[PDB]
What we know:
The longest helix has 21 residues, at 60-80. Helices cover 63% and strands 9% of the residues. The chain has one domain: Lysozyme (Orthogonal Bundle), CATH 1.10.530.40. The chain is elongated. It is built from 10 helices and 3 strands. Helix 3 crosses helix 5, helix 5 (93-106) runs antiparallel to helix 10 and helix 7 runs antiparallel to helix 8. Residues 30, 32, 70, 104-105 line the site of one chloride ion. Residues 142-145 line the site of one chloride ion. It is found in: Host cytoplasm. The active site is at 11 (proton donor/acceptor), 20 (proton donor/acceptor). Its EC number is 3.2.1.17. It catalyses: Hydrolysis of (1->4)-beta-linkages between N-acetylmuramic acid and N-acetyl-D-glucosamine residues in a peptidoglycan and between N-acetyl-D-glucosamine residues in chitodextrins.
Amino acid sequence: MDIFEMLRIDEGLRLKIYKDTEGYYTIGIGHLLTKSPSLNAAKSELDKAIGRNTNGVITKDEAEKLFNQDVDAAVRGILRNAKLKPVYDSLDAVRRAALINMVFQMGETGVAGFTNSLRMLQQKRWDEAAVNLAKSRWYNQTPNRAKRVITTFRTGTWDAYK
Ligand SMILES: [Cl-]
Ligand SMILES: [Cl-]
Ligand SMILES: [Cl-]
């Protein structure tokens, strides 16, 4: 298992524009296109992202390309963020993947706000962090995903993705 396979499990693959769990236009492996309610605005973002007139449909290779960029962006986002970098650097590789997964889903700013959770993780108080992480809109709106990510933080194993 690795961060790419983990996110493929959590995000799926869809080759036509769809709405994500928040109702936002998305394509591929959870590539958010726009928060605009305009499908035309989403189609424009898509064409700009892929470099061609897609008519709202892409290939698997194209979806994987955007996914690679998106994972890269989440990691670089963590490393540039004063609140996330220390926590990331304190973690082992498996738990690092759980943090990348959160940032991929919610964005750098949204995760960096989990101040109390981040502290517990930095302290390696795993059970306490797991309890604190679940007291969140995140957990309540996407509980099965959040449970998987939290299990990964709590255990430092990939058991939740087996
Ligand atoms: Cl995403
Ligand atoms: Cl708590
Ligand atoms: Cl979920």
